[PDB]
């Protein structure tokens with residue numbers, strides 16, 4: 466298992482990164498510092514997470530300490546839904562760059578295909594509780610992302626939470642200048658994503674798997690929800706390999722040629738989660754884990770189900 470995957474912009478991306486959604490601002494600086502110290506070279510960020518300044522403190526301190534060089538890091542962020550307008554994209558990117566203490570991003574993603582009305586609120590509501598859309602179509606947002614490449618602010622651009630028809634719309638865009646490098650989607654044994662993964666891979670788009678552990682700290686968790694980390698069937702595979710359940714859940718997407726971004730703010734778990742390059746799941750293990758699919762989503766964007774670009778009505 467090599468540590469990096471080649472993107473269609475010619476750059477290499479580390480297949481293991483550190484997630485930062487829900488990482489508290491008072492803990493994420495140390496989390497990122499520890500991650501870099503124990504070998505992580507890829508950090509997954511977003512403006513909507515409200516902690517990029519604190520992530521950036523860690524990155525800058527490790528660059529200053531010469532623990533790593535900037536060229537060895539792969540920093541990802543995402544354009545939030547209230548910035549899909551062409552006149553807002555550059556400023557949104559530049560705010561993320563300023564907060565992260567960077568001159569460029571390695572990868573910048575459209576966070577969701579759904580654009581929302583600009584303003585201070587990340588989920589602007591009408592008086593009846595619906596999210597207020599933007600009129601800007603995703604192809605125009607894509608053109609604005611392409612401009613960021615041509616201005617030197619980002620090395621690669623991509624998408625997140627796009628269904629296969631939405632990926633295809635980007636690939637079929639009149640005058641397309643840069644293909645998406647990555648589609649970042651939820652993926653784990655309860656949401657295995659065979660169809661969308663094969664489509665993206667067949668087009669040279671690398672897939673990143675988010676919520677690989679089933680996001681046990683998601684805000685809307687209910688006790689009756691299925692739990693990957695507690696599933697006896699997955700625990701049994703881990704025991705057979707003398708690894709933790711989390712380590713199996715991280716290795717699983719790696720063996721599907723995916724990038725994976727487990728989140729932790731716990732130093733011991735950050736280190737544990739990186740120790741996944743020294744064992745192999747068998748083909749039988751892989752097929753067994755795939756068999757657990759139940760189309761269960763951590764992130765359903767449940768307030769956006771009437772948005773014209775809501776991604777999860779389509780089968781895939």
Ligand SMILES: NC(=O)c1ccc[n+]([C@@H]2O[C@H](COP(=O)([O-])OP(=O)(O)OC[C@H]3O[C@@H](n4cnc5c(N)ncnc54)[C@H](OP(=O)(O)O)[C@@H]3O)[C@@H](O)[C@H]2O)c1
Pocket residue numbers: 483484485486487509510576625626649650674675676677678679680681682683694709711712726727728729730731734735737738763764
């Ligand atoms: N593009 C998108 O729309 C999108 C959506 C969701 C997620 N993401 C990205 O993907 C990342 C990962 O997804 P996620 O944050 O939803 O969840 P996740 O990585 O599946 O799970 C994180 C949870 O697992 C715990 N954990 C981590 N390592 C563990 C271990 N070895 N043993 C036991 N528990 C462990 C963490 O606890 P502690 O932190 O307390 O250790 C935290 O509660 C996000 O942080 C974000 O960067 C992107």
